Amino acid sequence: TRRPPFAGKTFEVRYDGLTALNAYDEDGRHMRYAITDGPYAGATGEVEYTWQPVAADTYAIAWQEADRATVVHIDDFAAGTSRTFFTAASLDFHRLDGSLRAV
């Protein structure tokens, strides 16, 4: 019964060297992404995510990809910002922060 306010919507996130779409299914449990810019452009995937409020209109969104890479977003939908922490399957740890806007 629990739905995040961003369910059923798609957002473009832009970081240094990376642009992606995060498309939240109406079901509140799945998100489909598409990397549209940078060295991994053309990748897609569906993930299961968790989400928790951390402040007004700001959520911690986390998931693990099929190759066991992990992703944590802190996405503020009012200010339009996205701060991300990404641990690749190789265990390289990447921090990025950028913009977030409704598509």
Automatic annotation (TrEMBL):
It comes from the Bacteria. InterPro entries: Calycin, MoaF-like. Pfam families: MoaF_like (PF22036). Residues 7-101 form the MoaF-like domain. This is MoaF-like domain-containing protein. The lineage of its organism: Bacteria, Pseudomonadati, Pseudomonadota, Betaproteobacteria, Burkholderiales.
